[PDB]
């Protein structure tokens, strides 16, 4: 039977008998992580004898 009104936006849906709820609980979570590392090492040595 059913035929209770269920809507999402302007569209209307027939809920199956088995379903207690299907509901547009709408959420969004975003995560950005960026890790840049640099190291450099330089060693010049000179030795001169005359």
């Amino acid at each position: 039977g059913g035929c209770s009104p269920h809507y999402i936006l302007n569209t209307r849906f027939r809920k199956p008998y088995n379903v207690e709820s299907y509901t547009p609980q709408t959420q969004g979570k975003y995560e950005f992580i960026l890790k840049e590392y640099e190291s450099y090492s330089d060693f010049e040595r000179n030795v001169t004898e005359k």
Binding site: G1, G2, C3, S4, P5, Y7, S21, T23, P24
Partner: protein, 49 residues
């Protein structure tokens, strides 16, 4: 509320079973509930939130 044009039983709709549409009258101009009113009927868990 029986044989009325509204599903006053919610999951069942037995009040609207075997009902002649010539005997029904328009219960209201509209059927569309407010855009997410169903969320007002959810339970809530205070610890988990």
């Amino acid at each position: 509320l029986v044989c009325n044009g509204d599903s006053d039983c919610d999951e069942d709709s037995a009040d609207e079973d075997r009902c002649e549409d010539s005997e029904r009258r328009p219960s209201c101009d509209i059927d569309k509930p407010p855009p997410n009113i169903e969320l007002t009927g959810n339970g809530y868990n205070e610890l988990t939130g």
